[PDB]
Amino acid sequence: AATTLPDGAAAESLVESSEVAVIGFFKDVESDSAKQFLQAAEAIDDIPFGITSNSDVFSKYQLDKDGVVLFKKFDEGRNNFEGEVTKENLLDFIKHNQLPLVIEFTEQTA
């Protein structure tokens, strides 16, 4: 489930509340692009998912339009979801954000 962030004040405190946390920036949470977000968020419950359509949260990360990104303390610290917004894609972004690689196998392909 995703929480309701009032403004950028929560976007910064959220990432601090837990090591792994994500926050989307949808301009029309009542649209379809937002529906998939919550649905895909319902999959994981241990992660503090957050979502807001305010403007102070958008101008914060300089977002000319809507966009969903994740927030973590390790690795880079920020991400940038692309392609289209869909439950199948969201579950991939998350799993692709937190949890770094692993010393095992070597992707035998090339």
CA-wise closest residue to 81 among 95, 67, 71? 67
- On whether the CB atoms of residues 80 and 69 are closer than 8 A, the answer is yes
Residue located via tokens 């979801």: 81
Calpha distance 85→94 (Å, rounded)? 13
Question: How many C-beta atoms lie closer than 10 Å to residue 110's C-beta?
Answer: 4
Calpha distance 55→73 (Å, rounded)? 24
Query: Where are any strands of DSSP class E within the chain?
Result: 2-4, 20-25, 49-52, 67-72
Query: Which technique was the structure solved with, according to the deposited record?
Result: NMR
Question: How many C-beta atoms lie closer than 10 Å to residue 26's C-beta?
Answer: 20
All domains of the chain, ordered by start, with CATH?
1-110 (3.40.30.10)
